[PDB]
């Protein structure tokens, strides 16, 4: 999944 800070 996407990183904590990805949009």
């Amino acid at each position, epitope marked *: *999944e*996407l*990183d*904590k*800070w*990805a949009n």
Partner: antibody
Amino acid sequence: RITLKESGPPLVKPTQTLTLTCSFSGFSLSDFGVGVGWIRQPPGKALEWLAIIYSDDDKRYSPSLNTRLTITKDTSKNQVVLVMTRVSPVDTATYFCAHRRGPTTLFGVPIARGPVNAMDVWGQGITVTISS
Amino acid sequence: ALQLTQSPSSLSASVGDRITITCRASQGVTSALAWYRQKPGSPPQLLIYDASSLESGVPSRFSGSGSGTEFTLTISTLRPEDFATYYCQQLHFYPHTFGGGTRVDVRR
């Protein structure tokens, strides 16, 4: 100045449980968006990402090791603990914990996320050997 | 998962050379990429964060560029302390992958 240091047993036997502690100073795991992660390096091999935990307590793990890892924090002691169960010889490696910055804030308003894209300060690393 | 391939895996050079190491991702990672230098017996040290920002206290001969799937680290004037292994790390997708590393050694 941020510094981190790993501690735990240098030797562990197969099937046993390995508990590693990262004690740090210079930041608090209650600071906004901060993270502390764990990375390992078997001798002569590449770095391998293991897990990370943030101050709001979100946790993420390597999918390949998910079932054997638990990461937790103790904010008041400035420590992050990583517990790996059922170790085997391939788990022998140098284990590092590292700091991850949270977004820059201006008057407590997040304005820059570029600083979160790196693990900026690392501990010296602790060598762990798994053998019976 | 996401793959990060470094090139070349090994590279020979001499003090004063300009070298460039590249890292390619299997899917786009935007600008969430970091470069590190690791000397034997020591932990990796952050050189460049967010694909191109120079980390504080890191010498200016180090430079990083690129975004998406292709990134490059260039050291403009190699110094003796640069004979080491370099790694790139992606932080856009979990798990936060590392490349295989590129060893930079004394050419002869």
